Design a protein around this ligand. Structure first.
Ligand SMILES: *[C@@H]1O[C@H](CO)[C@@H](O[C@@H]2O[C@H](CO)[C@@H](O)[C@H](O)[C@H]2NC(C)=O)[C@H](O)[C@H]1NC(C)=O
Ligand SMILES: *[C@H]1O[C@H](CO)[C@@H](O[C@@H]2O[C@H](CO)[C@@H](O)[C@H](O)[C@H]2NC(C)=O)[C@H](O)[C@H]1NC(C)=O
Ligand SMILES: *[C@@H]1O[C@H](CO)[C@@H](O)[C@H](O)[C@H]1NC(C)=O
Ligand SMILES: *[C@@H]1O[C@H](CO)[C@@H](O)[C@H](O)[C@H]1NC(C)=O
Ligand SMILES: [Zn+2]
Ligand SMILES: [Zn+2]
Lengths: 109, 202, 232, 111, 232, 203
């Protein structure tokens, strides 16, 4: 019946230690949050691609003779507790969220 | 490598999984009930239409289709047998699975399927703790916990093969998945063996 | 072929039309009675071969049609091709016919290179490809066009895709003439001697400062005779 | 204009006027704009990405073989933990947020 | 056409092969020297028509080849088409040739219906579409097959897509016989009378309990006779 | 019909920058968009478009090339002139744009091309967002006071305040910065004599 142009996988991540801030620098994630002892733990919902070429032409269903295609992982920004050297605060970190298909024109005639 | 897995294409609502029990029968959940069905076996592989829909009489139909999810819902007796209009061909990819014989051990390593899955069969109170639905003695409870990466999969009607043998059938659960550590509730298969074996023979 | 003129009847007997069952696929060049040569990116799962044709919808008795029993693409061609900087380097493929071409007046093989082409050489390219630059309008008649062999640097300048050792750059720099979609696998005969095959280019076709890129056959003449001798 | 492009078009915005959300349990819930954690005020902003159209082109998504495949663009969601009210309590619950625009395919029955 | 036989040398003169420049597109029936009828979903930007052909790769002087100046598809066809429950209802398209057809022995028009076809009737379908169910292997020779006209309920039961009162359900139930990809626009001649045009079905073709769906031409006989004289 | 001066500078393997067409021969982008190879796409390939190759790259000398992320980085003098190998054709989709004449008024409405309505804020509002160093040779613009904000950042792109070109987008986190934090553009009047000079001495 129906199926995706690029395959994906969704998992919850609780073992995330390092991440990339919105400003572009590295930051270290903090497992437990809110009060002196684990009122709630930080879990992130991520979605990555399974392969760049699910079908060796790239994405499924593309007109291989006309287009060059590849599947790439798209990111999103989520607020999360982290630390830089010693200052710890709520920062927007880059989280994987989808698998989209990209296109270019095929020069082959 | 899970040959018994079938996909129940319900027409204009969410898909359901199921288990192949006999060259002629398929076992899914009652909350998967609909007027039109299409059973996809394998993997257009094989696909047959369903002639005989049979929900366990002791299930609540009012619980069916788009209720605002309240935690006092007794999904108990969530079970259904679908009969194929034509038998399923056995291939190295389509194979049945036998009903349970022995009782489930708590602590067992179980498998589950699927916008694999290595579980452990926990006590029912662990499920009763997430006030999501009513958990009774006609149900099982399973969760997973070996790290910090839990996969988001919830296959309504799919199997729960514990210690190598069939034991349950995925009941109602949040979709695509639940809160990150939360257990899911499956329907216990032994408690209902008599009903199956008779409806499979009679 | 954009900006060309209809060929002269028996002028291109080496020209072949490679079909995939009922659909046009690419052009080609006949080398041996039981061997046809076309581009690698024309790889599909069946190759019928029309020999000795001038107009695809006309009744030509002098023609022939052979089936292909074996396909041998160069291992250098990244077949994932059937980021913008692609490398279509070793775009080459040998197609062995089932029953041989009946060599006659309208079906004649062209010989492989010994030479290394010189610049300024006027080269000819033929094909049933488009006569329109933007959208694709294929032709029934076999067109022919005379291009100039430019330095490979004119190509690397304008194209975002790698221009390399196994490529020949040819076209006109004022714009107006250039092979186009559907002309692939065709020949690029520079001064009576075959030197290339039509591989890739730019869409729209015939744009000023945008020459086409052809497969330099001289760097492959040893692979051809080797794989011809091994009767794969 | 001359290079690479998405198969389905999208738009990314920061939302700060969000009041309602349908959480992971399927329940309608109210989203507050300001948080209160460790002596400070930070406003709740969510990064959303939706589809621009279901048909960026009539035939469905771009670059698809419309004579063999049926196609449509659809919006994909994700779960983000946010401060919410479920009439009685104020708690941090996972809410459904729009995140991508993916292309779906089916097979054409037309011969 | 899967599970069929080759049609006799010049048995189906109403059969037309609709091309788009140099590539095959669909089949069709010849209604009038100036008119050809095919299926709406074959809508492209150019239509050539090859009249009176049997083997697309042979010399047939009996054949003619014309161009098309106008195309008129039924307004009921959702052109977004060319969720799994699609409605390919009014799949129909008139195609006006440029210069008229030279009606000869090998190019004869077929007559429209004035009858509601009967169930159980033995129907004939032809076309250069695939002979293999899954892989798409088009044919050089024109194939014919004999199907049985089943009730519309057999179709609705097996297909997830809409079966409406503008659709004719036909095929074999034991499987092995069915029209397939590339046969569209072709005729469904039941009991000597043209009653349908091949539209949609299931891939793999020729599966048990999965009949093909053809456009019911007698629920449209009005739109054709109107639009034909109008010279739109 | 909107912004015809905009151009895309295909920097090959690096991130695609934007630019403004100032003359039929000159394109103006940002110095930090500097690379070895360039390709300039003008217009809305599909002809309405236009693509030219660049024959001369000329960054401002007074720029720190080591910058090619820390808050003590001076992006001052972030400007570059690219000269096309063949002139751009003026069409109904490709038009040049004039250098500023008058000084920009604070509080003006400005346009900006994983087109927006900005307001020219006082340089301090930028200084307070410790991202980079803000100097008198830069402008500060911020999208303001709605409920939802947009996510755009076109390096080298034009900042057109009240009909006139007033700036060129300098550095900033991509795809976009934070929810209310402003962006910094390179103030153009301040470099007007330099552009006119590099344009009359390199033809
Ligand atoms: C075959 O082609 C693929 C592209 O389809 C090549 O993979 C790409 O390699 C380039 C560098 O050459 C990377 O920038 C791309 O990101 C790669 N593609 C993908 C989808 O990630 C591959 O290297 C080529 N292989 C050979 C032997 O030429
Ligand atoms: C013709 O096809 C289109 C799809 O391409 C139909 O649109 C869909 O219609 C169904 C209901 O019939 C909806 O559930 C889908 O969500 C629709 N959306 C889209 C984006 O496809 C359309 O209805 C059909 N034609 C007519 C005349 O209605
Ligand atoms: C059936 O389910 C509905 C909704 O949960 C409930 O109100 C009703 O009481 C149930 N039926 C019985 C007999 O308890
Ligand atoms: C260039 O950048 C470095 C690091 O930001 C800085 O220390 C140095 O002073 C800069 N160069 C000049 C000439 O200011
Ligand atoms: Zn099937
Ligand atoms: Zn161009």
């Amino acid at each position: 019946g129906e199926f995706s142009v690029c395959d994906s996988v969704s998992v919850w991540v609780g073992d995330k230690t390092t991440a990339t801030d919105i400003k572009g620098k590295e930051v270290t994630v903090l497992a437990e949050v809110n009060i002196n002892n684990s009122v709630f733990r930080q879990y992130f919902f991520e979605t990555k691609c399974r392969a760049s070429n699910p079908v060796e032409s790239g994405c499924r269903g593309i007109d291989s003779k006309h287009w060059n295609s590849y599947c790439t992982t798209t990111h999103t920004f989520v607020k999360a507790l982290t630390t830089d050297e010693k200052q710890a605060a709520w920062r927007f970190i880059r989280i994987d969220t989808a698998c989209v298909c990209v296109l270019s024109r095929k020069a082959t005639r | 490598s899970q040959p018994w897995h079938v996909a129940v294409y319900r027409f204009n609502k969410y898909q359901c999984g199921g288990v192949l029990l006999d060259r002629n029968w398929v076992l899914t959940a009652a909350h998967c009930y609909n007027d039109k069905y299409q059973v996809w076996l394998g993997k257009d592989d094989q696909h047959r239409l369903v002639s005989k829909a049979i929900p366990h009489p002791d299930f609540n139909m009012s619980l069916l289709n788009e209720h605002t999810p309240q935690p006092e819902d007794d999904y108990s007796n969530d079970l259904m047998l679908l009969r194929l209009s034509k038998p399923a061909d056995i291939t190295d990819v389509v194979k049945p699975i036998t009903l349970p014989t022995e009782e489930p051990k708590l602590g067992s390593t179980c498998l589950a399927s699927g916008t694999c899955v290595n579980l452990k069969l926990l006590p029912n109170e662990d499920c009763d703790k997430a006030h999501e639905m009513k958990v009774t003695d006609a149900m099982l409870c399973a969760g997973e916990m070996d790290g910090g990466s839990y996969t988001c999969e919830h296959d309504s009607g799919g199997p729960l093969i514990c210690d190598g043998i069939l034991q349950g059938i995925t009941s109602w659960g949040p979709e695509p998945c639940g809160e990150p550590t939360e257990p899911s509730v499956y329907t216990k298969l032994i408690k209902f063996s008599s009903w199956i074996r008779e409806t499979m023979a009679n | 072929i954009v900006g060309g003129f209809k060929c002269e009847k028996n002028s291109q007997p080496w020209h072949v039309a490679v079909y995939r069952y009922t659909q046009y696929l690419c052009g080609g060049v006949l080398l041996d009675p039981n061997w046809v040569l076309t581009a690698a990116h024309c790889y599909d799962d069946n190759y019928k071969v029309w020999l000795g044709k001038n107009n695809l919808f006309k009744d030509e008795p002098s023609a022939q049609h052979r089936f292909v029993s074996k396909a041998i693409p160069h291992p250098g061609f990244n077949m994932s091709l059937m980021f913008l900087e692609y490398d279509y380097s070793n775009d080459l493929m040998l197609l062995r016919l089932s029953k041989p071409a009946d060599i006659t007046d309208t079906v004649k093989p062209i010989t492989l290179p010994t030479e290394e082409p010189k610049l300024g050489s006027t080269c000819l390219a033929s094909g049933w490809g488009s006569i329109t630059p933007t959208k694709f309008q294929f032709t029934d008649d076999l067109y022919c066009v005379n291009l100039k062999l430019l330095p490979n640097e004119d190509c690397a300048k304008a194209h975002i895709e790698k221009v390399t050792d196994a490529m020949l750059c040819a076209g006109e720099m004022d714009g107006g003439k250039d092979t186009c979609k559907g002309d692939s696998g065709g020949p690029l005969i520079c001064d009576g001697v075959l030197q290339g095959i039509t591989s890739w280019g730019h869409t729209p076709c015939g744009e000023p400062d945008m020459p086409g890129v052809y497969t330099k056959l001289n760097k492959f003449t040893s692979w051809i005779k080797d794989t011809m001798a091994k009767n794969p």
